[PDB]
Structures are given as C-alpha cells and as structure tokens.
Amino acid sequence: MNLMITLLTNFTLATLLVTIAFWLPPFSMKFFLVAITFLLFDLEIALLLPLPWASQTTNLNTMLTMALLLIFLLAVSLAYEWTQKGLEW
Amino acid sequence: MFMINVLTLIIPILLAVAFLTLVERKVLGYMQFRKGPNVVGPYGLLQPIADAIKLFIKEPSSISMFILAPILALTLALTMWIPLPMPYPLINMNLGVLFMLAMSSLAVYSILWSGWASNSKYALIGALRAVAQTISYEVTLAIILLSVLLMNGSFTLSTLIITQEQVWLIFPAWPLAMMWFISTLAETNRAPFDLTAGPFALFFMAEYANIIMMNIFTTTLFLGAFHNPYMPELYTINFTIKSLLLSITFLWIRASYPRFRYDQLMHLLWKNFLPLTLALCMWHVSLPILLSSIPPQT
Amino acid sequence: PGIVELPSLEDLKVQEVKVSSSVLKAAAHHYGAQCDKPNKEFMLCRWEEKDPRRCLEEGKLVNQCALEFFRQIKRHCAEPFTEYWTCIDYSGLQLFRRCRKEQAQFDKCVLDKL
Amino acid sequence: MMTYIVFILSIIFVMGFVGFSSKPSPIYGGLGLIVSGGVGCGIVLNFGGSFLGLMVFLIYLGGMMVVFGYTTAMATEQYPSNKVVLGTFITGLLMEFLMVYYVLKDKEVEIVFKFNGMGDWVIYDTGDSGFFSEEAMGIAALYSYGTWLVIVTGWSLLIGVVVIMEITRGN
Amino acid sequence: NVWAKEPVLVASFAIAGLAVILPTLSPYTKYSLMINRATPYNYPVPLRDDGNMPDVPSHPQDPQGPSLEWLKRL
Amino acid sequence: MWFEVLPGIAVMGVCLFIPGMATARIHRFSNGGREKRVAHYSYQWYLMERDRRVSGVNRYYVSKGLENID
Amino acid sequence: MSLVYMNIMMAFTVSLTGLLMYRSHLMSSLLCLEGMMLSLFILATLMILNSHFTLASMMPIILLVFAACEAALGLSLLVMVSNTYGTDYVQNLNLLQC
Amino acid sequence: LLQAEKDRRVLQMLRENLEEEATIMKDVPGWKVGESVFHTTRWVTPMMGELYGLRTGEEILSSTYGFIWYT
Amino acid sequence: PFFDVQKKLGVDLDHWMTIQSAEQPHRIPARCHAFEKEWIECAHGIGSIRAEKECKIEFEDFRECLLRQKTMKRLNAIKRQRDKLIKEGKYTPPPHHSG
Amino acid sequence: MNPIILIIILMTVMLGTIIVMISTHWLLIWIGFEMNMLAIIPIMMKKHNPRATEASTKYFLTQSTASMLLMMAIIINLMFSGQWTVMKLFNPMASMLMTMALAMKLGMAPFHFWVPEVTQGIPLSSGLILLTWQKLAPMSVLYQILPSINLDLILTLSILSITIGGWGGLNQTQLRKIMAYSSIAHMGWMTAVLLYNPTMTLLNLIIYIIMTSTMFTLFMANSTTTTLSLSHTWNKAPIMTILVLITLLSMGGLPPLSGFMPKWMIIQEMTKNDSIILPTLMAITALLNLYFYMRLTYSTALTMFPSTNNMKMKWQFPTTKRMTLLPTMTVLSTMLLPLTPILSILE
C-alpha cells in the first residue's frame, strides 16, 4: 500500500499537470525480423537470469555445464543468423 | 510521514530537471564559444523557469490515446526513483534492478503509443523505426546487468553498496562498464543516437527524468565511497558530486560526435556487441566458481 | 467426525523472557555456549513427535534456562553490554562487523570474570 | 479501504479482461490487456509474490504487447465504435455484477465447486521460518536438478529462431 | 593474417575459449565446492545420541566432530 | 570561463542533494534516532513482529533492553 | 476454496469466449489467446504461492516462455497473411474451400 | 526459544478460540464443540483463520499483509 | 506406448519434478507433506482400484488438507452465526484485547 | 529449405513425439505437443502459395487452442489432487476438457472442420507427416490416462466422427480430402475402443499408419490430385493401378485382405462386452464409408478413361523416382491376413 500511495500521488500530480496544460489554452518484411529476434533473445535471457539467485548449491559442475550450454546455444543461434544473412539489410 | 517522504521525493524533480536544462545549455555554450544565457536573469535560472511557463503558454491521437501516451511517460518518470540507494533508499525493495528494466520497457510502450498517436504519417513510420532502435538495446543492457550483479549476490542493492565500498566495481570490469555506458547512451535517446508532438514540456520532462535516473543508477553501480554510518551526508555529498561529474561527462559526449546510420546502428549492435557480451558474461559465470568467491546471499 | 483435545491455560500461564531481539542477537554465541544444552531435549522431542501440546514443559525448561542466563548476565559482568546492544541497535539489520570494539570489550569482560 | 482487496483487484482484473474481450480495435485491446496484466501482477505481488510476478512481468509487459503493437501498427490502420462491442461489454458487466451480488451478500455460487464466500486473507502460512523467501530458491533451481528441462527448452528456442527466419524467408 | 579481418569476433572467440577451458585447470575448484557446502542453511536437527560413534561431541566447542578450519586459514 | 557556470551547477547539485538528506532526516526522525529495521525475509519479519509485540507500545523502536527479567 | 480462484476461472472463460468468437481481425483473437495465457500463468502461480509447492516452481516461467514462442509463430503467420493479402481479415479466406 | 514461544502462543490462541466457540454456538443444531475437519488425530498446522478469527482487520492485516507490502 | 527408458536407462530426469518428499534445495515441506507421504505409501503396491476402495480415507484427508473446503465451510458458518447474533447484539466481545 | 535444415526439423518432430511418449510429467507433454506444432508448421508452406499460408494458419489456430485447453486441464488437475504423474486423474471436469482438447488435437466430428482444408493446399509429404505423427501423438496419452474417463464423451465423439466421415466423403473430388475423411473415420474407430482394451487401438494405429504410408507413397510416385490424372497414370503404368486396387480394398477392410483384421478384432473385443447394437451400427457405418473407395478404384483401375497424348512422349522416359520404401510396406500392409496371433506383440 506504500507503493499504492506513491502511485496515487504521482498519478494525481500527473493529471493536475495535464489538466493545467489542456484546460488552460505499407511496411517492410525486414522490419519484422527485429521484433521476433529481440523477443526470442529476451526469452533466452529469461532462461539465463535465475543463475545469480542459484549459484550457492552443492552440484556446481552441473550448474556450470548447463550455464555453458545455455550461453553456447544462444551463441549457436546468433552465429546461425550471422552466417545466414539474417540481420542484414 | 510517508506522504511527506513522497513530497521530498517528487517536489525537487522539477527544479532538478529545469536546472539540468540550464546546465546542459550553458555547458554546450562553453563547449562552443557561446557565453549565455546570462543576460536576462542572474546566470539564467529565470530562463528555464520562463521556458517552462512559456511552453505552457504557447499551446493551441484519438484524444484518449493522445492523453494515454504522455501520461504514461510522465508517471514512469515520477514513480521510478523509488529504490535508489542514496544512502537510505526510499523503499527497501527486495528486488529493484529488474524493476528498473521493466519500467524502461514501459517507457518503450509510451514511446510506441505516441508513435501510433502521431496520426498516420511517414513521421509515424519513422517513429516505429525509433521504437526499433530503442528496443534494440534492452537485450544487451539486461545481460550486462546480470553480469555486474553476478558478483553481487542478489538484486537487493544494499548488499551491492556493501560490496562496492571496499574497491570500486570499475576495476573488475571496465570494458563491460563502457559497453553498459554505450547501452545507456542508446536507451536515453539523445545524441549521437537520433531521432524522433505534444505536450512538449511533459515529454521533455519525462526524457530528462529518465536520463537523471540512469545517471544516478550508473554512479551507484560502478563506483562508491567509504560509507561511515550515522552521518549519511558524507556519502550523499560525495555521491552527488560524482553523479554530477558523470552527468557532465555524459552531456560532454552528447556534444561532440556525429550520429550513426541506422543499418550501421543495428549491424554495430548485433555483430559487434552481442558475441562480446556473451563471452564476457560466460566469463563472469566461470570466474567465481574458479576463484572460490561467490557472494553470500543472506 | 474426530474432535480434538487441547490443553488449557493451566500450563500456559508462564512468564517469558521479553527482551528485544536485537540484544538477543547480540547475545547469540554466549547464550548458545553455556545454556542450550537441554533445549535440544525440546528439539529432539519436537522433531520426533511433531506435537505441540507435547513438549511444553521443556519449553518451560528452556524459558527458565534463558531466565537464568539473563539474570547471570545482568548481575555479573557487565554493564557495557547495555552499551553494546544500544550500539548495534540502530544498524538496520544487524551484522557483527558493525560494533566490533565494544564486542571486544565485552569479550574481555566475560573472559576475565567468567 | 477495506479488507477484500485481493477480491476487488480480481474484480478489476475481470473488468479489464471483458474490456478487451468485447473485440475492440486491437490497439485498444492491447491497452486493455496491458491494464489487465498490470492489475494481475499487482494481485500476484499482493500474495507475495515478491519475486516471480514482477520477475516474468518484464517478459509479458516488457516483451509481448510491444511486439503486438508493432505488428498491429505495420499491418493496417482500422480507421472507422460498433454497438456489438458495447452490448457485449454490458453483458460481461452484468455477469460480473451478478456474481458480485450473489457472492458478497450471499453464501456461494457453484459452477461445479463449492466457493466459500469470503475474501481470502486466509488461507495463508503461519509466519514459518523460511529465511530464504521460497520463491527465490524455487526458481533458483534447474541448475542442480534441471538437466533435461533447460536442454529441451533451449532446443525449442533454437528451433523457434530458425523457424521464424525460414518462414520469413530463410536465409 | 586472420586477426584484423573480423577482429572483435576473433577476440570474443579467444576469451570465450579460455572461459571454457579454464575450469579444466584451477587450484580452487574443490575449495570452492567445500566452501559452498560448508554453509548451513537448513537447520541441523539433533538425534538419539548414537551407538558410540567416533564423532559427534556434546558441546560443539569440543573439536571431536568433523569441522572446518581453513575458513580462517585463507 | 567556467567561473560563471559552477554556481548554477552547484544549485543543480543541491537540488540533487536535497531529497536524500531530507529522506534520511525523516528516517532518523521516524524512529527516535533509530533506523527502520529493514525486514526482508519471513524470519526477519517474524523477528520484527515479536519486537513490536514485546515493546508494549505495539511499536518496535523502544526495544526495552534487559530490564524485563525479574 | 480461496474465492479469488472463482473469478480468475470466470476470467479464463471470458477470455476463452473472446478467443473463439471474433469477427474482424486475427490480432484480436490472438491477443485474447495471449490474455488466456496470462490467465493460466496467474492462476497456476497463485496456486504455487498459497500451496507452498516450492520444489517444482518451474511452471509459470516455463509456461510463459513456451507459449511466448508460440505467440511469436502466430505473429509470423499473421505477417505472412497480411503480406499475401491487403488485410488481416477473418474474411478473404473462402478460397481453399471446404 | 523463538520456536518455543511461538508454539506456546499459538496454543494460547487455540485455547482462547475454543473458549470463543464455546461461548458463541450454544444454540446451533449439530455441531460437536471441538470438531477437527480431518479423521486421524494428528497435529495439523493452523491456517491463520483458526489462529486469528473474528479479529476485524487490524491484527490480521499486521500479521499477514504487513510483510507483503511493507518495506 | 509407455516406454521404459525412464526405468531402463536409469536417468531419473523426471522423478524429482513430480511430487514433494524429494529433497528441496532448502529442505522445507509444504502444507500437506505428511498427508502426501501417507497417501503415497497407501497407494504403492496397489492396482489403483482398491486404492479407490480402501485408501479413500487418506484420499479425502489429503483433499481436505489441500483445499480446507469444509474447514472454510465451518469457519463461514461460525462467521454467519456471529454476524446474525451481533445483529442481535449480545456480549460486546472480550475475545479481543480484554476479558 | 536446405536438406540439413530439413533433417534438423525432422529430428525435432521425432524428438517432440518421443518426449510425448516417455515423459511422465504433464508440462513436458504439453511442451512436446507445442514443439511438434512448431516443427510441423515449416514442413507445410514448402511452396509459397497462399493456399499453404491459409492451411498453416488454420492448423496453427486449432493446435494452439488444443494446447491451451490441455494446459487448462492440467492446472485444474492440480487445483484438485495435485501430482505430476500421468495417472488415473481425479476430476470429471479436468478429464472432460482434456478429452475435448484431444478431440481438437486428433480430430473429431465436433472438431474436424480444419482437416480437409489443411490437407488440400499442401504437398503430400507434409500431409503424410502430419497425419502419421499427429495421430500417433495422442495415442500414448489415451493409452496412459484411460482409467479416469467418462465413456460417453469418447463414445459420442467416435459415433459422430465415423458417421461424419461416412457422409462427408461421397461428394468430394480431391484425393486429399478423401484421405482426410478416411483419417477422421479411422481415428474415431481407434479412439472408440479405448476404455475396454487399448491393445486394439495401438495395433489399429500400426496398421492404419502402414496403410497411409503405402497410400501416400503411391501418390508420391505420381504427382496427381484428381481421378483424371489417375486414369492417365493407368494409361502410362499398369502396376500402379493394381496397387491402388489392393490398397484401396484394404482401406475398405475386406476379409481376404489385411485391412479387415483391425476391424474384426475390434468387433470381437467390443462384442465380448455385451453391447451389440452400438458395434453393429458402427460396422454399418464402416460399410457406408466404402463407396468412395470403390468408385475411386473404378475410376482408376477397373474402368478405363480416354486420355490426351504426349504420354506417348512420356513413354520413352522412366518413372524414375526413388521411393522411401514402397513395395515391402505394401505387401506388409495387404498380405497380413494369417498374422492374427501377432496381436500378442504388445505386453
């Protein structure tokens, strides 16, 4: 409710500013690769990111190996589109 | 005293942004051979207060969506200084760095809403390109954030200010710091990373509050000072001075270099940063498991 | 179908060691050192038979052992333990690197007199 | 300003879901789903919730509706709304408000269940000593245990990349 | 040569290759695993004492049990 | 030269300086010179709840040290 | 019974009907499918929170990344549809008859 | 010691809440006075409603919702 | 086809994602841990039909553990009786703060 | 469309189906259905006509809503008695929506509206791989969670599916829609005998996939879509026609030929249960869906249509394709009559 009070105060101040302002007077296919490419790398980011919360376990070799396989798989995908004229124009 | 905490947070943002505008105008003028503004007003503070009240005066989409874009940009600019650990942070959030990143993504939302709101023009197609060059850097910035907190246990950021006070984090990773700096250049959307309409003052306000947010977060992340307790004023003065110097350096780089080509921008990003980011991040994974120093999350 | 039986306040009228947790954290190693040998009776009782309303008299036992330890630290050495917890009190969440000098003085106290 | 705050946030969550499931123009639908995801993330953080709901918020309201607005903007314009959307929204509000009445001032309404009528501050854990904030270590699995799962997930992501580029004219 | 053709990529391959290989030789792998294993998160329960095992002291000050000392010995 | 701009830069820095100092003063005022007990976990929260329980005021800050034994 | 689950299931059913009945554009139906995805996410997440099923908490994040790449394939198909026609209509599909 | 105090306190709340139920339901049909819902007589962890019922807002919001949106 | 790679090649890739009583990373239970262990040991060497004939006691115990359906039913009956007799208006309550 | 990339995608089809087979966890089964969808989409649109675009769009929407309804059923299952085993479930509602999702998956008369559409405007290799693998996928699921299903669901699906495949099918002119309607009818058959003995279901799956492989291999041997080109392939090649004769009559399921054996054994272990009018009504429908088979065989091999020349010009040139394995699979698919106690292969 602390964040709710801050959100309320900032929203009401924003509405006061906007009411003071306004009450006192064809595409490319090559565009489409960027968004889905971004989103799939953001998905692999979502796979990578629980690592620093995890790094205190006993099975550390398994953690290190699957972390290597995750970054290496992201590298394989990036090198795939790199060699196969993906992010070109 | 919670609403008074809210007042002490969100009252000085207006004076901070307007004085940042006079500072960047004067420092651009001294990077050039231009004294001024110093005629009307002592050292030109009346000049930004007259800029604000004048741009409020000089005023003549789908009125719903036309309001929904800058209201989102301005409420993000307001609500995103909360977990900042100027010595005692406002809300001790358990995790705030991904909160920073998600609200940067909401800023990208507000930019896309205004881009649709610019009423069916080659202007809006250029605005979609601006959305593309804005969104093309939250991958790299998040992965660099993951590496630089990988030596820091968890997102809690007070444990970060514990880890920073021995030695600065610039020495464990200076090129990763420079790459994150370039990513902040690309995300703050000024020179050399350009470009592209009302209310101009409120959008102006939102972008500069975004830049101050990133500046304070940058000065937080990669440096610090010895924090003597029961006197926060020492760390507050020293952190404020170094945030001033970092923001001056950021405008100082905004001044003097030509812009990029769009395909040069994308080609540069992917095929120069992104394998280098991956190699630095797998090295940041493989390092503490081999040096027997993993950070103790509580 | 099955009703239960719950014990009365006949055994739940017991005074507690109602100090703050900051000074109790300041007395962590020492209270774990001399006392807290027969509280593992209560711990073993609870982790074997998972019943509260079973091992409560050993709860009285650990309560009076903590009361014994607190009277012993109150009467005997020393007074600047008060200084020690009011030193470590306002440090947000407590660490042990925070108030080290008075910790060393309290060490010298407890080593020289007990 | 009362106790049933999870219930009221669930009500506004269903309000937003109706507000875009009445089939508007799709960018207004994306606006409604952004508001719905915001209040749903508020729901899961109000169960606490301190880790996971804000964690995957970057992927859903950090990754999805941006790309939806992207592919909606570069597809067409839909410059004309219709009475059918307003009628469906009124019928959805009718169903919502009728469930509100027959739950709040009554006992239960059962599709095939028995919904006990009260705001659920209970059930809830009895302050048990986690000290590691169970969500944290929970999602911080997959690295001492999760061998197979990350392998097949990265396999599907790699195949998703090559599938997208092939269908969008590989190479 | 092969270097300045695509230089940042070759540099990335070099630093990534040493990041792969460097776990195969290190004087701190087993030290890392022992330091990580030697941190009690879960609470140690006691038990019914033993049938006279050559371990498990009564007071934990008594060094009869298997304990750590290299935490202080660098 | 820069002699004319550094007072304005200093005023902008004071506007950057002021919310941390004001917030820290309200922090130290809100607990009688003490800091807020920064509870992050369930264990810290139960510790803080027994702290506000044993103080009698239903307010954690008093902390009633060692004078409750006999 | 945790009364919030009733309205989240009602929200699921509303999102399901918004998936199935749709008149003008495929983007609306696919967005209702994304909202249904969000519904299943939130429902299973609150189950795992209030149940303290702490061991296999993989479900919400893995559900969302997989159905995310599903949605990415759907956007690829919609872009292909908008390319090989002028629009993205529910109509203009009577060819390849039944 | 915190474990022991917690167990004594929740048993005290259970004894007081059985006193509450012995006061209030003196006229209802059915209702054995101390029904556990289950079958096997083992100790079950309470659900915070048996610990804090009929409190009306204050202490339940402090003991449940305080950690969720405080600090 | 239920192939026996899981029981043949020995790699228990999914014999830990399944239910609890497996070793958590920090060893904690959930709300119904003993009920899980008892129900599973009731239905181990059982062909799933006399599980329904015989283990119904522990099955219903486990379900009322997992939902607290009749528990919240009884609690709401308590609340409705409290509401109607405080509408009646008797004994300004010393369950709270007093006696 | 590099052959390395297509071998990769075939490997993903295999991997998704095997994850559907072996995983005892529900999430991985959902992941397998998704990955098989994601792999089978670029198999289609091997060309770039809008026909394959619309076909893959329709199939994407159907498979997507099937996957989402399955995830719904799993989440409801853990709202009730919650365990991640593929076992006898504990909800009529969850098993109800789960069988409805599998009916979306493999096609039933409620859910068959996409099948002739998606099978018309695609190449035949894509139709082969989608029919074989997407009907092999739910059989493991039903084979493992049979003991907690209300039988009226699957029974109504089966009756209505076989009679829709009987009625729809007597009017069409495309071979792809003919094979699609036959797939509808036989999947109704192979789902109908679930809750009594899954041995018949799995063995009928074996026989039907062998039949469809032989049929689509024959239609790979001549790039034909209508009966007209089938008569032209009569006028250029005779042995293809006797193959069409024998294989189509085995799809008819006639007792000297091997296709009657999955019918007859189903009738046996369905009528050792003392319901009789339902199996004989289903067998009347199995009589009913033989007419289009028979008129197809008439227009191919037994009647002779006139033809246009340049097939004289074709006569100098061989039918020089390579087949995957046509003749071995054909004589396995047709001469398999005395191998009735090979039913015992399963347990």
mmCIF file of N, CA, C and O in Angstrom, chain B residues 271-273 275-276 279-280 282-283 286-294 296-298, chain E residues 8-9 12 15-20 22-23 25-29 31-32 35-36 41:
data_model
loop_
_atom_site.group_PDB
_atom_site.id
_atom_site.type_symbol
_atom_site.label_atom_id
_atom_site.label_comp_id
_atom_site.label_asym_id
_atom_site.label_seq_id
_atom_site.Cartn_x
_atom_site.Cartn_y
_atom_site.Cartn_z
ATOM 1 N N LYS B 271 26.347 -7.467 -34.456
ATOM 2 C CA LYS B 271 27.588 -8.101 -34.853
ATOM 3 C C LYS B 271 28.827 -7.422 -34.281
ATOM 4 O O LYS B 271 29.928 -7.705 -34.759
ATOM 5 N N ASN B 272 28.700 -6.541 -33.289
ATOM 6 C CA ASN B 272 29.912 -6.187 -32.572
ATOM 7 C C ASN B 272 29.774 -6.361 -31.073
ATOM 8 O O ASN B 272 30.710 -6.841 -30.432
ATOM 9 N N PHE B 273 28.632 -5.994 -30.494
ATOM 10 C CA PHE B 273 28.484 -6.137 -29.060
ATOM 11 C C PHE B 273 28.127 -7.558 -28.674
ATOM 12 O O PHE B 273 28.706 -8.101 -27.731
ATOM 13 N N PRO B 275 28.158 -11.001 -29.450
ATOM 14 C CA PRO B 275 29.073 -12.077 -29.030
ATOM 15 C C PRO B 275 30.061 -11.643 -27.962
ATOM 16 O O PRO B 275 30.442 -12.468 -27.119
ATOM 17 N N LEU B 276 30.470 -10.371 -27.962
ATOM 18 C CA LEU B 276 31.389 -9.885 -26.939
ATOM 19 C C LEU B 276 30.720 -9.843 -25.568
ATOM 20 O O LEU B 276 31.348 -10.188 -24.557
ATOM 21 N N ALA B 279 30.563 -13.521 -24.383
ATOM 22 C CA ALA B 279 31.848 -14.016 -23.912
ATOM 23 C C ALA B 279 32.209 -13.421 -22.556
ATOM 24 O O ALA B 279 32.688 -14.138 -21.665
ATOM 25 N N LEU B 280 31.937 -12.124 -22.359
ATOM 26 C CA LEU B 280 32.160 -11.526 -21.044
ATOM 27 C C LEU B 280 31.243 -12.119 -19.983
ATOM 28 O O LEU B 280 31.655 -12.295 -18.834
ATOM 29 N N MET B 282 29.730 -15.257 -19.962
ATOM 30 C CA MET B 282 30.150 -16.607 -19.616
ATOM 31 C C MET B 282 31.464 -16.589 -18.850
ATOM 32 O O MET B 282 31.709 -17.473 -18.020
ATOM 33 N N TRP B 283 32.288 -15.561 -19.061
ATOM 34 C CA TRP B 283 33.488 -15.423 -18.255
ATOM 35 C C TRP B 283 33.148 -14.987 -16.836
ATOM 36 O O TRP B 283 33.761 -15.460 -15.873
ATOM 37 N N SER B 286 32.021 -18.221 -15.229
ATOM 38 C CA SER B 286 33.107 -19.150 -14.942
ATOM 39 C C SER B 286 34.121 -18.607 -13.945
ATOM 40 O O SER B 286 34.943 -19.379 -13.447
ATOM 41 N N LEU B 287 34.094 -17.309 -13.640
ATOM 42 C CA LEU B 287 35.119 -16.761 -12.749
ATOM 43 C C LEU B 287 34.928 -17.136 -11.276
ATOM 44 O O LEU B 287 35.875 -17.684 -10.679
ATOM 45 N N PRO B 288 33.778 -16.861 -10.617
ATOM 46 C CA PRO B 288 33.732 -17.077 -9.162
ATOM 47 C C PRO B 288 33.694 -18.535 -8.780
ATOM 48 O O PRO B 288 34.051 -18.874 -7.645
ATOM 49 N N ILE B 289 33.287 -19.411 -9.700
ATOM 50 C CA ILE B 289 33.326 -20.839 -9.437
ATOM 51 C C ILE B 289 34.762 -21.350 -9.461
ATOM 52 O O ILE B 289 35.046 -22.429 -8.931
ATOM 53 N N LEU B 290 35.690 -20.578 -10.030
ATOM 54 C CA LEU B 290 37.092 -20.947 -10.051
ATOM 55 C C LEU B 290 37.955 -20.145 -9.099
ATOM 56 O O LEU B 290 39.102 -20.534 -8.866
ATOM 57 N N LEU B 291 37.458 -19.031 -8.573
ATOM 58 C CA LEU B 291 38.231 -18.255 -7.614
ATOM 59 C C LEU B 291 37.739 -18.410 -6.183
ATOM 60 O O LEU B 291 38.243 -17.713 -5.295
ATOM 61 N N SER B 292 36.767 -19.303 -5.951
ATOM 62 C CA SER B 292 36.216 -19.627 -4.628
ATOM 63 C C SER B 292 35.635 -18.408 -3.921
ATOM 64 O O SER B 292 35.660 -18.323 -2.692
ATOM 65 N N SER B 293 35.118 -17.451 -4.686
ATOM 66 C CA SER B 293 34.478 -16.268 -4.120
ATOM 67 C C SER B 293 33.141 -16.053 -4.814
ATOM 68 O O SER B 293 33.024 -15.242 -5.732
ATOM 69 N N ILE B 294 32.123 -16.759 -4.340
ATOM 70 C CA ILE B 294 30.753 -16.490 -4.753
ATOM 71 C C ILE B 294 30.122 -15.644 -3.652
ATOM 72 O O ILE B 294 30.421 -15.847 -2.466
ATOM 73 N N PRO B 296 27.872 -14.152 -0.794
ATOM 74 C CA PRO B 296 26.906 -14.757 0.129
ATOM 75 C C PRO B 296 25.599 -13.997 0.235
ATOM 76 O O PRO B 296 25.463 -13.075 1.045
ATOM 77 N N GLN B 297 24.664 -14.336 -0.647
ATOM 78 C CA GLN B 297 23.260 -14.017 -0.437
ATOM 79 C C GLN B 297 22.812 -14.462 0.949
ATOM 80 O O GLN B 297 23.114 -15.577 1.383
ATOM 81 N N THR B 298 22.120 -13.571 1.650
ATOM 82 C CA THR B 298 21.680 -13.810 3.021
ATOM 83 C C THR B 298 20.644 -14.927 3.101
ATOM 84 O O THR B 298 19.677 -14.940 2.343
ATOM 85 N N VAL E 8 36.901 -8.135 -33.502
ATOM 86 C CA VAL E 8 36.185 -8.261 -32.236
ATOM 87 C C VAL E 8 35.586 -9.655 -32.089
ATOM 88 O O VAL E 8 35.531 -10.201 -30.981
ATOM 89 N N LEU E 9 35.224 -10.292 -33.204
ATOM 90 C CA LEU E 9 34.680 -11.642 -33.148
ATOM 91 C C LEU E 9 35.754 -12.647 -32.764
ATOM 92 O O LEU E 9 35.513 -13.521 -31.928
ATOM 93 N N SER E 12 36.469 -12.285 -29.186
ATOM 94 C CA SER E 12 35.405 -12.914 -28.412
ATOM 95 C C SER E 12 35.561 -14.429 -28.382
ATOM 96 O O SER E 12 35.337 -15.051 -27.337
ATOM 97 N N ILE E 15 38.507 -15.164 -25.825
ATOM 98 C CA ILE E 15 38.160 -15.037 -24.413
ATOM 99 C C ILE E 15 37.087 -16.056 -24.025
ATOM 100 O O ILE E 15 37.102 -16.584 -22.904
ATOM 101 N N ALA E 16 36.219 -16.441 -24.964
ATOM 102 C CA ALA E 16 35.226 -17.465 -24.673
ATOM 103 C C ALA E 16 35.863 -18.844 -24.581
ATOM 104 O O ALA E 16 35.454 -19.670 -23.757
ATOM 105 N N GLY E 17 36.882 -19.099 -25.406
ATOM 106 C CA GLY E 17 37.578 -20.370 -25.341
ATOM 107 C C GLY E 17 38.356 -20.534 -24.054
ATOM 108 O O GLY E 17 38.381 -21.624 -23.474
ATOM 109 N N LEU E 18 38.978 -19.455 -23.568
ATOM 110 C CA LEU E 18 39.638 -19.575 -22.271
ATOM 111 C C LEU E 18 38.621 -19.654 -21.137
ATOM 112 O O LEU E 18 38.900 -20.275 -20.104
ATOM 113 N N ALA E 19 37.430 -19.067 -21.322
ATOM 114 C CA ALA E 19 36.372 -19.234 -20.332
ATOM 115 C C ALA E 19 35.838 -20.663 -20.300
ATOM 116 O O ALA E 19 35.359 -21.120 -19.258
ATOM 117 N N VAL E 20 35.896 -21.374 -21.426
ATOM 118 C CA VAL E 20 35.524 -22.787 -21.437
ATOM 119 C C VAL E 20 36.624 -23.640 -20.815
ATOM 120 O O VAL E 20 36.359 -24.516 -19.984
ATOM 121 N N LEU E 22 39.447 -22.887 -18.917
ATOM 122 C CA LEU E 22 39.901 -22.517 -17.576
ATOM 123 C C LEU E 22 39.260 -23.268 -16.395
ATOM 124 O O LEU E 22 39.931 -23.437 -15.371
ATOM 125 N N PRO E 23 38.008 -23.757 -16.462
ATOM 126 C CA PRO E 23 37.569 -24.715 -15.431
ATOM 127 C C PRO E 23 38.264 -26.066 -15.456
ATOM 128 O O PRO E 23 38.192 -26.780 -14.449
ATOM 129 N N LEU E 25 41.407 -26.570 -15.357
ATOM 130 C CA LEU E 25 42.591 -26.497 -14.511
ATOM 131 C C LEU E 25 42.481 -25.266 -13.624
ATOM 132 O O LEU E 25 42.409 -24.140 -14.121
ATOM 133 N N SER E 26 42.419 -25.492 -12.307
ATOM 134 C CA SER E 26 42.304 -24.422 -11.325
ATOM 135 C C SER E 26 42.668 -24.965 -9.957
ATOM 136 O O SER E 26 42.318 -26.113 -9.649
ATOM 137 N N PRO E 27 43.349 -24.191 -9.120
ATOM 138 C CA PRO E 27 43.665 -24.660 -7.767
ATOM 139 C C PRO E 27 42.580 -24.342 -6.749
ATOM 140 O O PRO E 27 42.849 -24.351 -5.544
ATOM 141 N N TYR E 28 41.366 -24.033 -7.205
ATOM 142 C CA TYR E 28 40.312 -23.654 -6.272
ATOM 143 C C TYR E 28 38.950 -24.269 -6.567
ATOM 144 O O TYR E 28 37.951 -23.793 -6.016
ATOM 145 N N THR E 29 38.868 -25.316 -7.391
ATOM 146 C CA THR E 29 37.581 -25.941 -7.686
ATOM 147 C C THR E 29 37.033 -26.674 -6.469
ATOM 148 O O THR E 29 35.899 -26.429 -6.028
ATOM 149 N N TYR E 31 38.112 -26.396 -3.452
ATOM 150 C CA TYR E 31 37.982 -25.421 -2.378
ATOM 151 C C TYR E 31 36.664 -24.678 -2.491
ATOM 152 O O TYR E 31 35.982 -24.467 -1.485
ATOM 153 N N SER E 32 36.275 -24.325 -3.722
ATOM 154 C CA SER E 32 35.005 -23.656 -3.977
ATOM 155 C C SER E 32 33.834 -24.524 -3.547
ATOM 156 O O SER E 32 32.902 -24.055 -2.878
ATOM 157 N N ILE E 35 33.721 -24.792 0.344
ATOM 158 C CA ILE E 35 33.232 -23.563 0.967
ATOM 159 C C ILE E 35 31.731 -23.413 0.752
ATOM 160 O O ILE E 35 30.994 -23.017 1.665
ATOM 161 N N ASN E 36 31.242 -23.785 -0.436
ATOM 162 C CA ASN E 36 29.807 -23.695 -0.686
ATOM 163 C C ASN E 36 29.039 -24.749 0.107
ATOM 164 O O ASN E 36 27.940 -24.475 0.605
ATOM 165 N N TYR E 41 22.331 -23.677 5.697
ATOM 166 C CA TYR E 41 21.038 -23.023 5.513
ATOM 167 C C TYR E 41 19.942 -23.782 6.252
ATOM 168 O O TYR E 41 19.221 -23.206 7.072
#
